[PDB]
Write a protein that binds this ligand. Structure first.
Ligand code: MYR
Ligand code: MYR
Lengths: 390, 390
């Protein structure tokens, strides 16, 4: 064995630790929005956190794993107050201020002396909700593995009562642009839910896929945002994009595609994007460790002359609702990684027939990045408008 | 493909690049001693180097490979005077001063902007010899892969004349000790050839393996050296050692073993070592990439509470002589890697029924480390003495 019980790091794990620097933390995160149960006492949160604070249960893997050289070792002294925070948003708890708080928290490095995760419970969200923000290093999980952890730790049964804390359960065509700039550590997170049936209706009317429509909505929104800052490149943006929107224990194949942001017509943009996705020869399967390794090298350590301007990621979420001690998971937003030369990341999760959009950027490279949420909505409306006339 | 022709780094490659720091370069080296041909003109070296300087031939892989992000790319502009040096040792060219020169050269980092190798030709060595010192990053080759490059680039035929430069051809039981100390970048290299038949005769007389005898010779020598500096630990040194001395395209399995340096009798030391090598349960095969990966993690990124005090490596060399433009390869010495917590490395190569010993150390952790060559000889003589009486 290896030091009696330890496990060597996987090469994938080691990539994300070696590439982490002050200016580019290599953790991912999930913003969970929970609806307080209809029949819950006013002390529902206080009691849930109190059960956590007094619990004698020990974290189960991977939450009890910590680094020891090039090996995963077991944490023998769980330090709750290192990993856990319970705070409240001041009245009236608007989503604006929640996202400010998450932007700040997503900026800070994880301490490598302890298991590489933290958990925030934020009470007082408008609309009778509370939030959990779970930060976890990419050396431990990517989005798909994170989703499996979510499904193991939460319940599909609204009646089941939680008895332990969640962590104890069971070739270079891309132009220069302001997106491609050295980054700071300070982040801006902008998140919003969209009804997936709007994209489904557009796809059916124009005889394309939902993935085609989503990518065209992103393209038009990026074109509008860049134009508003007089920063639209002459050549179109190139992006690493999914081949599909949902694809069986599977990570979706990723494709190098032309986003056609230099065209001024939405149908023209959609047409170029659809063809590019269909016909691109730079296709990166993510079914085997080696395939995932090679994809990770392309994306996080690309060779240079750049190859692409941004990554648009898709992390499938569950189709059936989840619950925490009876509280319904109302929304789930992904927060991914920015790094030098990639100051904007777009990641999306499908959950309950919603498209959960998580935008993460370097605060100083992309000012007012949150405007992209408005540009996205306006682009959906544009496609809906042209179909309404047709 | 990956950027049209490039190749992703192997995880093994990436370990040796990521762990390199100022104080611990991660290159290996070979010191080649050549005998000038009996019928050679006095301008043999001048002409060989001149043929190199004027050659229009291009390096072949791996010598034309260079880093580009997390990928191997092709070097499109070979810069001879970056990679190549021709110097002379001042008269009378003793081996003492050759090893001083190699100690200094083995201390310096390789520039990552170019292919990760350099070649030194040193003329004027005593005894009608010249030396080649070839430095190459472990991200490109380990010892066994290096030996295969040597056999491809040199000739087995004394009559064959070279027409191109060589690069164009075709659980924690180990005590604290001064060996286990943070290191500087400055190196001391101490190299010497021993007749392998002396170890063979000892092995036959005492009914043990040659590997058993070599390890016992190392143990007694290390005990004497440490005692001479009042630095012999009370507990025995633990070492990562080979299971055999020659083992088919194979890397020898490595074993965690008790060197028994706390015993004062050579036969006692030999007995403990032989049993430990036979019975140790920490055995690390190196037949597959995964196995080599895991071995590399143990050795170069060990977990801590250390596990071992040093590594004694064996790199098999050819059994038949090699030649360069008629000049016989008379001797071949390996120079390996020291790092934080491992200030001494012992590596050995079998060539022409000789045991070629290459000792490499942090200059400042182990003063007068070259005395170990004397202690090694004295230990062989000790075993020969006890057999002569028996
Ligand atoms: C119960 C603990 C679950 C932890 C889930 C953390 C969030 C999942 C990652 C979302 C972003 C992934 C980005 C990506 O890999 O493309
Ligand atoms: C023709 C170029 C050949 C380059 C050979 C360089 C020397 C081989 C490495 C010797 C030390 C190896 C240490 C080890 O891996 O255990």
């Amino acid at each position: 064995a290896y030091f009696a019980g330890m496990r060597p790091l996987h090469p994938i794990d080691f990539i994300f630790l070696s590439l982490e620097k002050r200016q580019q933390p290599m953790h991912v995160g999930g913003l969970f929005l929970f609806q307080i149960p209809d029949n819950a006492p006013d002390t529902f949160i206080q009691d849930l956190v109190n059960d956590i604070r007094i619990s004698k249960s020990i974290p189960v893997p991977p939450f009890n794993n910590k680094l020891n050289g090039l090996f995963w070792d077991e944490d023998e002294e769980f330090d709750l107050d290192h990993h856990f925070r319970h705070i409240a948003l001041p009245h009236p708890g608007r989503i604006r201020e929640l996202l400010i708080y998450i932007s700040q928290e997503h900026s800070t490095l994880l301490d490598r002396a302890k298991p590489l995760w933290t958990c925030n419970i934020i009470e007082g969200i408008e609309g009778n909700r509370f939030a959990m923000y779970f930060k976890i290093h990419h050396a431990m999980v990517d989005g798909v593995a994170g989703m499996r952890l979510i499904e193991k730790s939460l319940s599909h049964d609204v009646t089941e009562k939680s008895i332990v804390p969640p962590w104890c359960v069971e070739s270079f065509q891309a132009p220069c642009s302001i997106l491609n700039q050295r980054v700071s550590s300070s982040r801006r997170f902008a998140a919003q839910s969209f009804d997936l049936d709007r994209f489904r209706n557009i796809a059916k009317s124009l005889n394309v896929t939902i993935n085609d429509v989503v990518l065209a909505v992103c393209s038009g929104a990026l074109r509008a945002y860049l134009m508003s800052h007089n920063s639209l490149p002459s050549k179109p943006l190139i992006a690493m994009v999914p081949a599909s929107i949902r694809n069986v224990s599977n990570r979706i194949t990723m494709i190098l595609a032309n986003l056609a942001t230099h065209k001024d017509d939405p149908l023209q943009r959609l047409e170029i994007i659809r063809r590019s996705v269909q016909n691109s020869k730079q296709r990166f399967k993510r079914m085997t460790s080696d395939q995932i390794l090679n994809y990770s090298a392309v994306v996080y350590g690309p060779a240079g002359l750049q190859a692409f301007n941004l990554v648009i990621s898709n992390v499938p979420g569950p189709r059936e609702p989840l619950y925490w001690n009876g509280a319904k998971l109302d929304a789930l937003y992904p927060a991914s990684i920015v790094l030098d030369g990639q100051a904007l990341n777009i990641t999306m999760t499908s959950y309950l027939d919603k498209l959960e959009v998580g935008l993460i950027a370097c605060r100083n490279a992309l000012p007012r990045m949150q405007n992209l949420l408005t540009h996205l909505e306006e682009e959906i409306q544009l496609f809906e408008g042209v179909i309404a006339k047709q």
